[PDB]
């Protein structure tokens, strides 16, 4: 009914402690989504082209060619930590728990309203009570999956501020070639957009693949409750790298007085020691030689682009880096860098139109430091001669800036690593699994990955508001009455975490407020706000 409300705004989280310390966190989100009528009621296929840019020689990475079907539908996407937990709850979940399990997820659209604008320099807005807002929910997932969180196009992270959905659009198959080159490269590299291969053509439309519901003021649509099925994320980090795995060499000479220079001592000739190693040659048994069960971490090619059918692309790393030898200044390939607008973090009161960025660097020691790597000649005669050793300092291919470690992959049967950690408050939450016959061991964008099917996509769109003049048989773009619309949105994501227990004697790391961050969690005398990213795996944990 017009004068009747059809739902309830609620943005309240709820920790429900149960038996055996397994809390049941119920995060509720409500927002006031705002929505205008499409630029055109049509589906368009468009090609983005920037030859000129990549045509520079030694500029291949700045490639941007591609094609896309530009649907007239907007997409309401709430997949991002910043939509379900304020900083206050994120500090709770991160300090006290150890593992999170995604459980359900339900959402509805209530209190819909549609209005229409009129001139002159004085616009006038009046309800159009018979108009309709279209909602459609691709539940089976006939529609291609497009996680908005990857281009900061999710929902507002502040409950007390309106928000908006993103215009949906998806990738359309296209061939394209482009040969790599540096600056000194002579001539012109084949840089061409070939076109399309019919065998891979796929044009989707909501109309034909999903049942669209029309809603009027008095209406309201609510999805069902979906239950995720997939592995538990953890909120602990490991630090033991292959070098701190096992039983330490038994010292024979323990130091006799406190002193930053009083080191105990193994006390046994490197080649007279007992133990095991994989070096059939020597009899040396050092910390870098002894034999650790397997290998934490792996070495992968850095800033290497591979390329197929549609063009060059970076070769994703799952380890990253980190360390007393990074400090974000040394931030290398691996550590993800988030760039975002005012809706999700950047100081609202901030003008100018430059994104806000931060490079997340996890607490886990499982990435590598290439500098220290090296390779010796099987014979193993040390001190190693220059001819028998290949360092990260020696050039490869003849390039001064390229070393062996730059094309090195050490990923093998004995590799062990962890899944990407949650990145509050800009990270994705769940991601759909690849429909390939052999799937990845992890997605580098999401902590959780629905095994079976992921929740479906929810699309909305303001129904066409025809005037009194209209003739389809004409080429002229139809003309509609200006009509925008506002409606409320409310989801409910429910994870089930497990409490933590202290095993150490020493206290551990804990997220906390200090005289230094103190002002990142309060608004400005203007009403300015901002959400500063938090790390999510504070406490350590034995790996072996």
Regarding 262 and contact with a second copy (CB under 8 A), the answer is yes
Taken in order 312, 205, 223, 229, the sign of the CA dihedral is negative
Residue with the CB atom nearest Ca ion in the bound state:
199
- Show contacts with a second copy in window 472-511 (CB under 8 A): 472-475, 478, 481-482, 484, 486, 488, 499, 501-511
Q: 396 touches which of a second copy, Ca ion, none (CB within 5 to 8 A by kind)?
A: a second copy
**Breaks in the chain after (C-N > 2.5 angstroms):** none
Regarding 102 and contact with a second copy (CB under 8 A), the answer is no
**Of the candidates 104, 224, 227, 369, which one interacts with a second copy according to CB under 8 A?**
369
- Show contacts with Ca ion in window 208-247 (CB under 5 A): none
Q: Which stretch binds a second copy (CB under 8 A): 100-108, 222-230, 365-373?
A: 365-373
Regarding 278 and contact with a second copy (CB under 8 A), the answer is yes
**Of the candidates 52, 199, 306, 469, which one interacts with Ca ion according to CB under 5 A?**
199
**Alpha-carbon distance 393 to 387, whole Å?**
13
- Show contacts with a second copy in window 5-64 (CB under 8 A): 5, 7-13, 15, 17-21, 23, 32, 34, 36, 39-49, 53, 56-64
Regarding 525 and contact with a second copy (CB under 8 A), the answer is yes
| Residues 348-387 as x/- pattern, contact with Ca ion by CB under 5 A | -----------------x----------------------
- Buried residues in 152-181 as b, exposed as e (16+ CB within 10 A): bbbbbbbbeeebbbbebbeebbbebebeeb
**Site size for a second copy, by CB under 8 A?**
355
Q: Which long-range contacts (CB under 8 A, 24 or more apart) does 523-531 make?
A: 524/349, 526/349, 527/348, 527/349, 528/347, 528/348, 528/349, 528/350, 529/158, 529/347, 529/348, 530/345, 530/346, 530/347, 530/348, 531/82, 531/87, 531/157, 531/344, 531/345, 531/425
Q: Which is nearer to a second copy, 105 or 292 (CB)?
A: 292
Q: Which is nearer to a second copy, 105 or 321 (CB)?
A: 321
Q: Which stretch binds Ca ion (CB under 5 A): 199-207, 249-257, 310-318, 512-520?
A: 199-207
- Show contacts with a second copy in window 180-239 (CB under 8 A): 180-185, 194-205, 207-219, 231, 234, 237-239
> For residues 133 and 114, is the Cβ–Cβ distance under 8 A?
yes
**Alpha-carbon distance 120 to 104, whole Å?**
49
Regarding 197 and contact with Ca ion (CB under 5 A), the answer is yes
**Alpha-carbon distance 185 to 486, whole Å?**
55
Q: Which is nearer to Ca ion, 94 or 529 (CB)?
A: 94
Identify the CA nearest to 91 among candidates 235, 238, 239: 235
Which two three-digit tokens encode residue 139? 């539940």
In angstroms, give the least distance from the CB of 199 to Ca ion: 4
Regarding 101 and contact with a second copy (CB under 8 A), the answer is no
How many Cβ atoms are within 10 Å of 485's Cβ, its own excluded? Answer: 24
> For residues 62 and 54, is the Cβ–Cβ distance under 8 A?
yes
Applying CB under 5 A, which residues contact Ca ion?
197, 199-200, 365
């Amino acid at each position: 009914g017009v004068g009747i409300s059809t739902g309830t705004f609620n943005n309240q989280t709820e920790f429900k402690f149960l038996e055996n310390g397994w809390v049941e966190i119920t995060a509720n989100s409500s927002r006031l989504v705002h929505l205008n009528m499409p630029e055109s009621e049509n589906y368009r296929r468009v090609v983005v082209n920037n030859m000129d840019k990549t045509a520079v020689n030694g500029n291949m990475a700045l490639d941007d060619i591609h094609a896309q079907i530009v649907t007239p539908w907007s997409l309401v996407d709430a997949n991002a930590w910043g939509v379900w937990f304020n900083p206050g709850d994120w500090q709770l979940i991160v300090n006290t728990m150890s593992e999170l399990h995604l459980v359900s997820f339900e959402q509805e659209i209530f209190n819909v309203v549609l209005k229409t604008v009129s001139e002159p320099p004085t616009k006038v807005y009046n309800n159009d009570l018979t108009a309709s807002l279209m909602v459609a929910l691709d539940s089976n997932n006939t529609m291609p999956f497009t996680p908005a969180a990857m281009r900061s196009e999710t929902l507002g992270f502040y409950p007390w501020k309106p928000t908006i959905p993103t215009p949906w659009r998806y990738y359309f198959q296209w061939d394209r070639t482009l040969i790599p080159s540096h600056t000194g490269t002579s001539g012109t590299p084949t840089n061409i957009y070939h076109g399309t291969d019919p065998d891979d053509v796929q044009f989707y439309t909501i109309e034909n693949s999903v049942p669209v519901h029309l809603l009027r003021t008095g209406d309201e649509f609510a999805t069902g409750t979906f239950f995720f099925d997939c592995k538990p994320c953890r909120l602990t980090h490991t630090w033991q790298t292959n070098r701190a795995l096992g039983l330490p060499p038994f010292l024979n000479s323990l130091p006799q007085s406190e002193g930053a220079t009083n080191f105990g001592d193994i006390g046994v000739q490197q080649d007279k020691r007992r133990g095991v190693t994989q070096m059939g040659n020597t009899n040396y048994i050092t910390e870098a030689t002894i034999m650790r069960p397997a290998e934490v971490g792996y070495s992968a090619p850095y800033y290497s682009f591979e390329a197929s059918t549609q063009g060059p692309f970076k070769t994703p790393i799952a380890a990253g880096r980190g360390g007393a030898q990074t400090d974000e200044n040394q931030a290398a390939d691996g550590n993800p860098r988030y760039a975002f607008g005012r809706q999700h973090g950047q100081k609202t009161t901030t003008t100018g139109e430059t994104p806000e960025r931060f490079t997340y660097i996890a607490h886990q020691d499982t990435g590598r430091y290439p500098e220290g790597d090296w390779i010796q000649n099987i014979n193993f005669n040390l001190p190693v001669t220059n001819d028998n050793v290949l360092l990260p300092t020696d050039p490869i291919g003849g390039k001064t800036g390229i070393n062996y470690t730059n094309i090195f992959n050490t990923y093998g049967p004995l590799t062990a690593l962890n899944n990407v950690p949650p990145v509050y408050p800009n990270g994705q939450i769940w991601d759909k699994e690849f429909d390939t016959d052999l799937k990845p061991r992890l997605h580098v964008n999401a902590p959780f990955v629905c095994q079976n099917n992921c929740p479906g996509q929810l699309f909305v769109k303001v129904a066409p508001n025809l005037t009194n003049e209209y003739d389809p048989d004409a080429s002229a773009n139809m003309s509609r009455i200006v009509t925008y619309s506002d409606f409320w949105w409310k989801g409910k994501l429910v994870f089930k975490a497990k409490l933590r227990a202290s095993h150490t004697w020493n206290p551990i790391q804990q997220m906390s407020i200090n005289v230094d961050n103190q002002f990142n969690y309060v608004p400005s005398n203007i009403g300015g706000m901002k959400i500063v990213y938090e790390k999510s795996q504070l406490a350590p944990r034995k790996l072996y």
